Design a protein around this ligand. Structure first.
Ligand SMILES: [O-][O-]
Ligand SMILES: [O-][O-]
Ligand SMILES: [Cl-]
Ligand SMILES: [Fe+3]
Ligand SMILES: [Fe+3]
Ligand SMILES: [Fe+3]
Ligand SMILES: [Fe+3]
Ligand SMILES: [O]
Ligand SMILES: [O]
Lengths: 233, 232
């Protein structure tokens, strides 16, 4: 329900807030907002209330969709009514009120979004993990990577503090939903070159400090998806 | 609307801006099976009612999780008592759960009142990690979800020239299917089913020799992570 500030300086904040639950994020920069994967038509008023402790919903200029899934995108009609924001999503999904002038299509290799503070955000290619058109968002100023489904925990604190206790919450999901070790290890190599201090997924607790390294090391060697093709037929 | 198969007890029916979507209905001894009804809800209801009372839809099949498949889920659960079959990967992600039947990864059979079966066909990573087609054994029609989809609005109901249909499907399959490894396994699996039609969720239907043409083309297609330098 309530909002938790993960990073703060004078001009810029990164804020957290039968089904798997979902994590929603807000970036505030010189008083303007960027909303990350707000999906979930249910208590739309919970997210609005939480946002309103930091910024007028008026002032959300950008809404970022990591990919096309309903847990990401379901509430899109409600946000379009109270904001004038553009919606950033992979060009794979744009061609599917919802008026086309609200869409910013992200090309396959990503793009940057400039912020009033002088900092940038970078859309991080994350394709086929699982969706063929998926991006993360790297907030350069905080060094927080919003990673979409990557790092997600699906089975029921803010930060991970024991990777071994966390592993059972993420192992089945990554083994089955990430497409292959080939895609997963290239992503790790790409993300390592960013030097994120946190990895904040769309489900479950956030990786910070040594747990970023722990997660990245585990993922880069994971066999997943079509690596077990005999399980898929 | 176009009747694709019909005998005394069993029919398979195509119910007739954004890329547009194909909705299908199976009628069997007077009961209904709706395929991917997602995507003017008042059009689909009326169209269904030309063949069957919406009362009598017992089953709704979702090939995967995307909004063009699932967006109308609340309305279909509200106006029917049908169960919804979907990959177990997605049951816990469609924001009452006892109405969802999770399909296990290797598929399952769904029995029809006439005695015929429908088979859920594993179609994972093409594109969604949890995707199934529905093979209606009596008609030998495979409803294929996104596989075979055309996204460019050219012209016709059945594919009649594979080479002319190709520009409408090539880019979609090259970019959205995960790898040649997965698609050629799928082709080999579908070859052992001997479908007389492949009916996709977008674009024209492949029948007879065009089933052959599509499968031969897809089985050699380099796609998805095969072009990984384009993805970073
Ligand atoms: O897919 O979460
Ligand atoms: O249609 O993806
Ligand atoms: Cl997907
Ligand atoms: Fe997802
Ligand atoms: Fe998700
Ligand atoms: Fe799809
Ligand atoms: Fe589709
Ligand atoms: O998702
Ligand atoms: O889809």
């Amino acid at each position: 329900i309530d909002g938790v500030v993960l990073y703060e300086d004078a001009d810029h904040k990164f804020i957290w807030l039968g089904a798997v639950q979902t994590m929603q994020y807000l970036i505030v920069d010189r008083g303007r907002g960027v909303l990350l994967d707000p999906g979930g038509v249910h208590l739309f008023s919970r997210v609005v209330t939480a946002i309103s402790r930091f910024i007028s919903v008026d002032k959300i200029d950008t809404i970022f969709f990591s990919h096309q899934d309903p847990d990401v995108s379901s509430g899109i009609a409600l946000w379009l009514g109270i904001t004038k924001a553009k919606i950033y999503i992979s060009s794979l999904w744009v061609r599917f009120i919802v008026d086309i002038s609200r869409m910013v299509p992200i090309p396959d290799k990503g793009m940057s979004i400039s912020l009033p503070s002088g900092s940038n955000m970078k859309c991080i290619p994350s394709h086929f993990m699982h969706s063929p058109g998926q991006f993360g968002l790297y907030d350069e100023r905080s060094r927080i990577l919003f990673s979409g489904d990557i790092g997600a925990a699906v089975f029921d604190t803010t930060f991970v503090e024991d990777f071994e206790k966390h592993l059972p919450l993420i192992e089945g999901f990554h083994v089955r939903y990430m497409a292959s070790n080939k895609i997963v290890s290239k992503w790790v190599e790409y993300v390592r070159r960013l030097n994120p201090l946190m990895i904040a997924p769309q489900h479950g607790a956030i990786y910070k400090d040594e747990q970023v390294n722990n997660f990245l090391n585990w993922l880069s060697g994971l066999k997943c998806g079509t690596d077990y093709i005999e399980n898929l037929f």
